[PDB]
Design a binder for these strands. Structure first.
Lengths: 99, 135, 62, 138, 189
RNA sequence: CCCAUGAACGAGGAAUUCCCAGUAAGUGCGGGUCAUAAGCUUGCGUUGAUUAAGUCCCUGCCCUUUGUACACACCGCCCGU
């Protein structure tokens, strides 16, 4: 049966979308179908921020940030628990988690 | 010999931390980067296949690097942290954080921190197949 | 290595394959208290005193 | 009438007939630290070092002490003396002095008035005892 | 003759503090003139530590199958030949209690690691209650499993442990094992 | 009941069973069977703990969502010389 109305991708009004490689397995997944995460974290973790700040030559250096873009195939996105399977009705909900 | 000027002023080197997922490098060079002071990796501190990239081995390498640099007259470090880069993973390995902390806790001063993983404008094909690695 | 007194506000719980480690949240009494979370084991009295004999060991979760 | 509960604990009992009489210092009728099992012989010497010799010139406590078990027969003499002082002081002068010596004795140790409720529990099915089970084969 | 109890004094016995009752706390109903009380310390957690480390040391020495719980032996250890030496010392009697552990006391241990590997151990430390629980559980267990057939046997098993039990030194030997492994665990930072 | 001629006389192949306090274990005593008939069981006392106040890793159970070509219900169905 037709599980998803959008076929589990975002291809509307075009024939071909360029593929990308999953960051985990290096699988070829279309860019609309791939599950994209954008992690903007700190280069130095919280347990290491304090020690780096004390050792800093500059007062209030404001630490740099790490910007990483992750593309997951469906298998690796499900295994890594980035997304889970939802009920037939909860599947239609497109609201992102509040975080 | 050594820089014997301004005992109240810092001496700055550059630490090139290559935190791969297989092992980690702690590589302190001259400010230009051409001449290297000391390079210690996780694989010369622990002897087994997996733990080459462990945080413990990374902090041991960072401690050894800090000791050698202090004996060589370097007091402060700029941090140039990198991942494998290329078409492969862009995130730094488990040894990056522990190496940086072991530098900041072993008597060293930290200057500018920046990320230098090689990012392609677009790359060649990855080592996997079109179906990826299936293990 | 100075031992700092820490009061427990919340016990995070047990960690391990079968359950062998503990995690709690602790804060200072009158020493510009910060809500710092560290690993504990077993008995924690009502307002017990964790020994922050080191301020840089925030036991990491996950 | 007659109010007499004497001392008891676990299994053993020191029947303490409280009245006027000689009231010499004796445990099982025997001297201060002289009991044959020789294990818990100090428990009575403590209080009589505070008040004085005049106070025990008229308190005859005739005790029928029967029962095997140290933690029973001992720790029942302390209960018995606590109740003896309590009754004597309550009846004679006022309960304020009884309040005071009972305060020191009972806040001194909780375990007079409270006995151990623990007792051997029932054996059950398919096992050598209460909780243990017979070995299960496959 | 205004001294309190039979061994303490109040006129000129000054400890210049009150904050020195981590393991020993006898100020309430839990006082019995001798540590002979029988009783239970397994009815609920934390109760083994609430047994004061003096009573814990002398009474948690009940292991193996020959002297397992029998309280006449703790009575012998603490009753005979200690109250006499308390005054036969001639010096200040605090030395025995205050010459044991304040530098011995283990201040860290660790916990198992991951799914594959045992070559390290994630660092954990506790408030005194569980550190005393774990460390001296393993101490008593090791001392009994290895020190079976002991030349240091009872009727003289008061001195060494009552001098290396409570507080005030770094001289205990299973404690040195746990302190070296404590440093090994401490290396996890 | 006992005469001392020594029992690998002081922690145990892969494989495993039971157990959270008056509990495990030691220890004996009754009942059933029966003629006193017990190394069985069923109870009872007595001495009396070490560990733990946790977890879902193993073995399984339950409450939800999900997939199924199974419904004899995965010890299922089924593919190719």
């Amino acid at each position: 049966t037709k599980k998803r109305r959008n076929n589990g991708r975002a291809k509307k009004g075009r024939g071909h979308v360029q593929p990308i490689r999953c960051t985990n397995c290096a699988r070829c997944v279309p860019k609309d179908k791939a599950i994209k995460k954008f992690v903007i974290r700190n280069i130095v973790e919280a347990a290491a921020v304090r020690d780096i700040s004390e050792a800093s030559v500059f007062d209030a250096y404001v630490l740099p940030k790490l910007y990483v873009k992750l593309h997951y195939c469906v298998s690796c996105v499900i295994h890594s628990k980035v997304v889970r399977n939802r009920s037939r009705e909860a599947r239609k909900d497109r609201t992102p988690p509040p975080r | 010999l050594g820089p014997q000027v301004a005992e109240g002023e810092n001496v700055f080197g550059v630490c090139h931390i290559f935190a791969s997922f297989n092992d980690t490098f702690v590589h302190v060079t001259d400010l230009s980067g051409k001449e290297t002071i000391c390079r210690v990796t996780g694989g010369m501190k622990v002897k087994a296949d997996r733990d080459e990239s462990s945080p413990y081995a990374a902090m041991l390498a960072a401690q050894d690097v800090a000791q050698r640099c202090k004996e060589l007259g370097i007091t402060a470090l700029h941090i140039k942290l990198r991942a494998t880069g290329g078409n492969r993973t862009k995130t730094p390995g488990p040894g990056a954080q522990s190496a940086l902390r072991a530098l900041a806790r072993s008597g060293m001063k930290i200057g500018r921190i920046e990320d230098v993983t090689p990012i392609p404008s677009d790359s060649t094909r990855r080592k996997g197949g079109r179906r990826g690695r299936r293990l | 290595q100075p031992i700092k007194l820490a009061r427990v506000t919340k016990v995070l719980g047990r960690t391990g394959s079968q359950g062998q480690c503990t995690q709690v949240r602790v804060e200072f009494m009158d020493d510009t208290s910060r809500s710092i979370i560290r690993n504990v084991k077993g008995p924690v009295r009502e307002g017990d005193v964790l020994t922050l004999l080191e301020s840089e060991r925030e036991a990491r979760r996950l | 009438q007659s109010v007499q509960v004497f001392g008891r604990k676990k299994t053993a009992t020191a029947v303490a007939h409280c009245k006027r009489g000689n009231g010499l210092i004796k445990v099982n009728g025997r001297p201060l630290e002289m009991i044959e099992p020789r294990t818990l012989q100090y428990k009575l010497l403590e209080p009589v070092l505070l008040l004085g010799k005049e106070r025990f010139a008229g308190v005859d406590i005739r005790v029928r002490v029967k029962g095997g078990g140290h933690v029973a027969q001992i720790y029942a003499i302390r209960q018995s003396i606590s109740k003896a002082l309590v009754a004597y002081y309550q009846k004679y002068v006022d309960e304020a002095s009884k309040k005071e010596i009972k305060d020191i004795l009972i806040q001194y140790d909780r375990t007079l008035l409270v006995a151990d409720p623990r007792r051997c529990e029932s054996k059950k099915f398919g096992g050598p005892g209460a909780r243990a089970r017979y070995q299960k084969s496959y | 003759d205004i001294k309190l109890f039979g061994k303490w004094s109040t006129d000129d016995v000054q400890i210049n503090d009150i904050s020195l009752q981590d393991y020993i706390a006898v100020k309430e109903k839990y006082a019995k003139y001798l540590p002979h009380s029988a009783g239970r310390y397994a009815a609920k957690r934390f109760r083994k530590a609430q047994c004061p480390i003096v009573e814990r040391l002398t009474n948690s020495m009940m292991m193996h199958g020959r002297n397992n719980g029998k309280k006449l032996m703790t009575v012998r250890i603490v009753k005979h030949a200690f109250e006499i030496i308390h005054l036969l010392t001639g010096e200040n009697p605090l030395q025995v209690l205050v010459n044991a552990i304040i530098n011995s006391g283990p201040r860290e241990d660790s916990t198992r690691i991951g799914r594959a590997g045992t070559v390290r151990r994630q660092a954990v430390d506790v408030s005194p209650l569980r550190r005393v629980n774990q460390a001296i559980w393993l101490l008593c267990t090791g001392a009994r499993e290895a020190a079976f057939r002991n030349i240091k046997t009872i009727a003289e098993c008061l001195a060494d442990e009552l001098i290396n039990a409570a507080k005030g030194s770094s001289n205990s030997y299973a404690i040195k094992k746990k302190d070296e492994l404590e440093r090994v665990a401490k290396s996890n930072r």
